[PDB]
Design a protein around this ligand. Structure first.
Ligand SMILES: Cc1cc(-c2ncn(C[C@H]3CC[C@H](C(=O)O)CC3)n2)cc(C(=O)NCc2ccc(F)cc2)n1
Ligand SMILES: [Ca+2]
Ligand SMILES: [Ca+2]
Ligand SMILES: [Ca+2]
Ligand SMILES: [Zn+2]
Ligand SMILES: [Zn+2]
Length: 164
């Protein structure tokens, strides 16, 4: 017989993702680069690896949508809800949805896709929101004045509690 694990996390270290569609705001290449950077955030702090697929069913299915887009978490136009992701599991588990009513960028203007993706992929891996206002996993997007992205201890401790 078998039983479910209590804590939601991936039991395999080699995970796949697929970009199902693309925002108009950035080139295919720029969108791909943002998501790869966002996954490297987590692979640098865990034994996890991420591989992009060009078709078929991946562990993490990434898509852009607006308002109602096929789940219980409709988007709300510009600002407010930027994105959401499902915790580890089969079916929709891991999937990440991005609101295409946002202005997506690779800069400090609008909403930085890499930064939002890095946060949402945290959710894809099993993290909940942080109560720490400086954490990656704090719920409210807060672009800081730092030159480079650095993962805070809060988020590192959270992800380590799941993946070691
Ligand atoms: C650890 C952390 C860092 C930053 C932040 N803001 C500017 N930076 C500098 C980076 C420079 C290189 C940029 C580059 O590589 O282009 C990406 C940003 N880092 C912002 C947040 C943050 O806003 N956290 C909460 C949050 C994030 C996303 C989200 F959707 C909802 C909440 N968290
Ligand atoms: Ca999935
Ligand atoms: Ca929104
Ligand atoms: Ca848009
Ligand atoms: Zn959704
Ligand atoms: Zn979140």
């Amino acid at each position: 017989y078998n039983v479910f694990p209590r804590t939601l996390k991936w039991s395999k270290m080699n995970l796949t993702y697929r970009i199902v569609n693309y925002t108009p705001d950035m080139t295919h290449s720029e969108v791909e680069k943002a998501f790869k950077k966002a996954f490297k955030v987590w692979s640098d702090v865990t034994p996890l690896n991420f591989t992009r697929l060009h078709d078929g069913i991946a562990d993490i299915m990434i898509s852009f949508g607006i308002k109602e887009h096929g789940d219980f978490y409709p988007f709300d136009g510009p600002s407010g809800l930027l994105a959401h992701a499902f915790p580890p599991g089969p079916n929709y588990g891991g999937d990440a949805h991005f609101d295409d009513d946002e202005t997506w960028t690779s800069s400090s203007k609008g909403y930085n896709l890499f930064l939002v993706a890095a946060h949402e992929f945290g959710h894809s891996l099993g993290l909940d929101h942080s109560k720490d206002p400086g954490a990656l996993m704090f719920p409210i997007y807060t672009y800081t004045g730092k030159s480079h992205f650095m993962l805070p201890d809060d988020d590192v401790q959270g992800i380590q509690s799941l993946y070691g």
